[PDB]
Design an enzyme around this catalytic site. Structure first.
Site, mmCIF file in Angstrom:
data_model
loop_
_atom_site.group_PDB
_atom_site.id
_atom_site.type_symbol
_atom_site.label_atom_id
_atom_site.label_comp_id
_atom_site.label_asym_id
_atom_site.label_seq_id
_atom_site.Cartn_x
_atom_site.Cartn_y
_atom_site.Cartn_z
ATOM 1 N N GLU A 18 -22.392 3.686 -0.568
ATOM 2 C CA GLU A 18 -23.159 4.830 -0.669
ATOM 3 C C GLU A 18 -24.708 4.476 -0.294
ATOM 4 O OE1 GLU A 18 -20.911 4.680 -3.247
ATOM 5 O OE2 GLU A 18 -19.485 6.199 -2.283
ATOM 6 N N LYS A 27 0.740 -1.216 -0.072
ATOM 7 C CA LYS A 27 -0.077 -0.037 -0.003
ATOM 8 C C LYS A 27 1.097 1.300 -0.230
ATOM 9 C CE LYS A 27 -3.921 0.387 1.277
ATOM 10 N NZ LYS A 27 -5.376 0.409 2.076
ATOM 11 N N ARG A 78 -25.091 7.878 -6.541
ATOM 12 C CA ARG A 78 -25.321 6.488 -6.382
ATOM 13 C C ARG A 78 -26.389 6.033 -5.120
ATOM 14 N NH1 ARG A 78 -20.294 2.461 -6.863
ATOM 15 N NH2 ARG A 78 -20.075 3.720 -8.925
HETATM 16 C C1 LIG Z 1 -18.589 4.968 -5.831
HETATM 17 C C2 LIG Z 1 -17.204 5.639 -5.318
HETATM 18 N N1 LIG Z 1 -17.345 6.017 -3.871
HETATM 19 C C3 LIG Z 1 -16.220 6.631 -3.414
HETATM 20 C C4 LIG Z 1 -15.177 6.867 -4.058
HETATM 21 C C5 LIG Z 1 -13.967 7.631 -3.636
HETATM 22 N N2 LIG Z 1 -12.644 6.800 -3.622
HETATM 23 C C6 LIG Z 1 -11.778 6.864 -4.402
HETATM 24 S S1 LIG Z 1 -10.378 5.713 -4.055
HETATM 25 C C7 LIG Z 1 -11.339 4.967 -2.723
HETATM 26 C C8 LIG Z 1 -10.682 3.775 -2.265
HETATM 27 C C9 LIG Z 1 -10.436 2.673 -3.082
HETATM 28 O O1 LIG Z 1 -9.940 1.484 -2.628
HETATM 29 P P1 LIG Z 1 -9.214 0.427 -3.437
HETATM 30 O O2 LIG Z 1 -9.860 0.018 -4.425
HETATM 31 O O3 LIG Z 1 -8.750 -0.681 -2.359
HETATM 32 O O4 LIG Z 1 -7.672 1.161 -3.786
HETATM 33 P P2 LIG Z 1 -6.534 1.817 -2.951
HETATM 34 O O5 LIG Z 1 -7.440 3.016 -2.133
HETATM 35 O O6 LIG Z 1 -6.106 1.028 -1.782
HETATM 36 O O7 LIG Z 1 -5.609 2.505 -3.691
HETATM 37 C C10 LIG Z 1 -12.376 5.780 -2.732
HETATM 38 C C11 LIG Z 1 -13.387 5.558 -1.631
HETATM 39 C C12 LIG Z 1 -14.982 6.605 -5.639
HETATM 40 N N3 LIG Z 1 -13.804 6.691 -6.367
HETATM 41 N N4 LIG Z 1 -16.212 5.889 -6.040
HETATM 42 MG MG LIG Z 2 -6.688 -1.164 -1.812
#
Ligand SMILES: Cc1ncc(C[n+]2csc(CCOP(=O)(O)OP(=O)(O)O)c2C)c(N)n1
Ligand SMILES: [Mg+2]
Ligand SMILES: [K+]
Ligand SMILES: [K+]
Ligand SMILES: [Mg+2]
Lengths: 536, 493
Positions: free
Chosen positions: A286, A226, A314
């Site tokens: 959401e 990470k 959403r």
């Molecule tokens: C539907 C939606 N809700 C919230 C977000 C905000 N968001 C962007 S990155 C993320 C976390 C994604 O986690 P992951 O897929 O494990 O990747 P990592 O953050 O570890 O790089 C969020 C909540 C989004 N992009 N889309």
């Molecule tokens: Mg992740």
């Protein structure tokens, strides 16, 4: 670029060339690609960090899969920088996130290597199933593969998708990019493999090569580092909200705050730590966040859903059907309202003043500064006849003085300046610019405060005392606040010309917030020009 | 009904002796004569201290027995025994953990139980709900009425016979002191627009290989039975998953096929983000056949397709069409189907068509309305199936009448032309007035600084109650007499 500093990366301008390199040469490529990522992209982009974790995975994918023929999909796409670098955009990477530069995430119109334009999460598997179904009917052996994060696979979408995939059984590979088990995925109908080392390029290649050829839904679970993380999508309004949250939670035990995996973004870190028992992170869900608030409201508590304007899209059905219809007094603290900047099209909080307005029983407030924000959160929190919303932009406050919290009369605006001929009605944080215009044109200035219900009496009053009205909001002109003002005048049959100033009818391009507001004519100068052209 | 007669309250039900309960089920089942939740409904009210304990039914379509022992679905304002107002599915578990957490903090030992069907557990929001519950672990019981969970965090029990009154009672009582999230699995046993849509689908699927029709668990509802049988390889039922339905369509388009998402205006609300982010932003040409648009009637507030023209309208790149009759409907489906520059939508009401002549299919010029009658002083701009009534008003007031056809993009020239030709305009649409089609008309006139008064006729700012479509339309003033009366009063201002 520096051909000698990256001798191996230099040999790659297209995935085709990459597939020509000998396997043993790949580990070295990965090192150059990682160093190149840290040397070319401005750290101000943050996402270069998320890309670091997919370096090996990206090389392995484009080396094994026949892209762009085979279809590769990245979820969210904040981890696709190396993907863009290896697909003909190596020398353009430094412009990513900037106005006129490469898109922040994969974008279909930007390259034939980008299958799905992403930004919101969890869409990869669904589109992926649609793509694999078409490929199977095409009969040309086109392969499909999706990369989804542990966080993103949290959305209901992903489940609906996987469950469906489990039923029609399309030939496709879902890769879980886990940087934070398999029983669930097998139950859903997938052939599960892993967990596997996500930083072993040669190991991934032989594994990917085997699974790309297998039949039915395939699921490879890999693990990546990470790292130190990345920044989420005068104090900011997020901090204003957070502070208010903490102080209110200390006053009464009925406050419950919810976030769909955006604790830091919505400024709820300190809050979650001081009130673990009033805090809820439902992951990237959401929909459940909103209906969960309904339950809490039903149980007698006072829920607050902290959600971005763009992501609140959403949970529309839960807001309307589960909260609005039932008159449940849920408070929505909508962050990132207006144009958000670098994140671009997929993340603009450009529509909440419209999609929320047609909802019966909904109270919509738009603060012009941080004091108003506090007052409105306060008002919203104590408003118990139904749902209320307070939306604010991503960014810093104006630096106004904070006064003791006091409930604001519902649906009432306030005149800030008495002018002549022209009355400017402001909705939101674009006030400072609107104020400049009023002073420059000696027009009347009004801070509307509420988008719904509208201060009708005041509108009618301004229309009766001025030749024309001008509405200002950082939201789509179509169906927005200005549109609401037009509706009031038309209903009372008081047709007074009204210039609705707001967002154009196209998705807003990436760039600096200031830089993009100026380009759209959302600053003092731009606004006066519009008014000039309109009156002409 | 000797046993049921002794029951006018759930407290009376609890006074009866167990051995009598089975007879109650038979009587209760014959009284009604849905009937598949009789044994469970009794067991629950017999064991639980309702209405103190919160019983939550998912969808409510099968809450008749629950209502007897106590609106088409459980409505909180009707009875205190209806904890959560439903209509759309998969909300139970979600609101339920919210209620369970509240009950936990209340400290009055209040219990929470949610009953959800096998269909409702296919929704994405049920998945998110159970996952969250498996994490914070509140005390509660989720009952799956079946007519993975352990992996989500729940303690699974069963399967068990859902038709054994005394059996369910014993089990419920046995789980009284079990902590955390519990899951009990039980086992139980004149053309309409929907019709022209289905016929159009079959006709079109016979002309090419590109057509693909998707539905989120509503085959018969959307009149696609025939189509599913004739073109099984072009039909896709993705269960109660509106979100996936739309993004799956986006994938089909990316792959070179022509997807058509057949969905209700109310349920389309649940796929709003996918429509905007996965279709509009990518400018993918998915066609949306929006059924049950406008007042649906007997189903009440939870099923009204009333905001359809407001939430899609603010979306850039979206093409919105509103048929005024069944012939227009086929033309628009055809047009939207062959419009490849972006997403298009065709919305139509539930119920029978006008009975007009069907003309051979032909593409309609996008964003162009048509003048049907030229009158004076007033110009009535119609959007949709309320046309018959609007036409009556036009003839009665000798007003010009125009069938706008498109909600977006709007026919700006026609609007400006009409505004210059009359003293006032009146817009008619069976959608919320706020942010609706007429509202778009207001916007054009204002942008051009040609403010002629406009009377926006549509649905009021409140969820409309259940009742036959005609009754509700007459009651809201979407009647010919009601519209004319509205116009007069408006001009009297
Ligand atoms: C539907 C939606 N809700 C919230 C977000 C905000 N968001 C962007 S990155 C993320 C976390 C994604 O986690 P992951 O897929 O494990 O990747 P990592 O953050 O570890 O790089 C969020 C909540 C989004 N992009 N889309
Ligand atoms: Mg992740
Ligand atoms: K409140
Ligand atoms: K099309
Ligand atoms: Mg069922």
């Amino acid at each position: 670029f520096d051909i000698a500093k990256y001798p191996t990366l230099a040999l790659v301008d297209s995935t085709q060339e990459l597939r020509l390199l000998p396997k043993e040469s790949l580990p070295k490529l990965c090192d150059e690609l990682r160093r190149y990522l840290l040397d070319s992209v401005s750290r101000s982009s943050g996402h270069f960090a998320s890309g670091l974790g997919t370096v090996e995975l990206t090389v392995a994918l484009h080396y094994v899969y026949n892209t762009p023929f085979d279809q590769l999909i990245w979820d969210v796409g904040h981890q696709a920088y190396p993907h863009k670098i290896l697909t003909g955009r190596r020398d353009k990477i430094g412009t990513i996130r900037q106005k006129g530069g490469l898109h922040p995430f994969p974008w279909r119109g930007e390259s034939e290597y980008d299958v799905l334009s992403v930004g919101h999460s969890s869409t990869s598997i669904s589109a992926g199933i649609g793509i694999a179904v078409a490929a199977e009917k095409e009969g040309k052996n086109r392969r499909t593969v999706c990369v989804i994060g542990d966080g993103a696979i949290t959305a209901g979408m992903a489940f609906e998708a996987m469950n469906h995939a489990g039923d029609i059984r399309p030939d496709m590979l879902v890769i879980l990019n886990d940087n934070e088990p398999g029983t669930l995925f097998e139950e859903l109908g997938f052939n599960y493999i892993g967990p596997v080392d996500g930083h072993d390029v040669l190991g991934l290649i032989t594994t990917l090569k085997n699974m790309r050829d297998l039949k039915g839904p395939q699921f490879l679970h890999i693990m990546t580092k990470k790292g130190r993380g990345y920044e989420p999508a005068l104090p900011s309004y997020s901090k204003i909200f957070g502070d208010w949250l903490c102080e209110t939670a200390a006053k009464d035990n009925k406050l419950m705050a919810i976030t769909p995996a955006m604790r830091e973004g919505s400024g709820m870190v300190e809050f979650s730590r001081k009130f673990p028992d009033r805090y809820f992170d439902v992951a990237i869900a959401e929909q459940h966040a909103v209906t969960f608030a309904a339950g809490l409201a039903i149980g007698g508590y006072k829920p607050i859903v902290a959600i971005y304007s763009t992501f609140l899209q959403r949970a529309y059905d839960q807001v309307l059907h589960d909260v609005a219809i039932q008159k449940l007094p849920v408070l929505f603290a909508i962050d990132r309202a207006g144009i958000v900047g670098a994140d671009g099209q997929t993340h603009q909080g450009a529509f909440d003043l419209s999609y929320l307005r047609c909802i019966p029983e909904m109270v919509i407030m738009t603060p012009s500064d941080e004091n108003e924000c506090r007052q409105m959160l306060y008002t919203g929190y104590h408003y118990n006849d139904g749902p209320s919303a307070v939306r604010y932009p991503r960014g810093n406050a104006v630096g106004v003085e904070l006064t003791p919290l006091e409930k604001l009369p519902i649906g009432k605006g306030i005149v800030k300046r008495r002018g002549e001929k022209l009355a400017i009605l402001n909705f939101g944080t674009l006030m400072p610019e609107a104020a400049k215009v009023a002073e420059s044109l000696n027009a009347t200035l009004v801070d509307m405060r509420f988008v719904k219900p509208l201060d009708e009496a005041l509108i009618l009053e301004m229309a009766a005392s001025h030749e024309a009205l001008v509405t200002v909001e950082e939201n789509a002109i179509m169906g927005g606040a200005g549109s609401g003002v037009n509706e009031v005048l038309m209903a009372h049959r008081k047709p007074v010309p009204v210039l609705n100033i707001g967002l154009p009818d196209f998705f807003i391009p990436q760039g600096t917030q200031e830089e993009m507001r100026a380009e759209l004519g959302l600053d003092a100068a731009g606004m006066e020009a519009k008014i000039k052209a309109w009156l002409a």
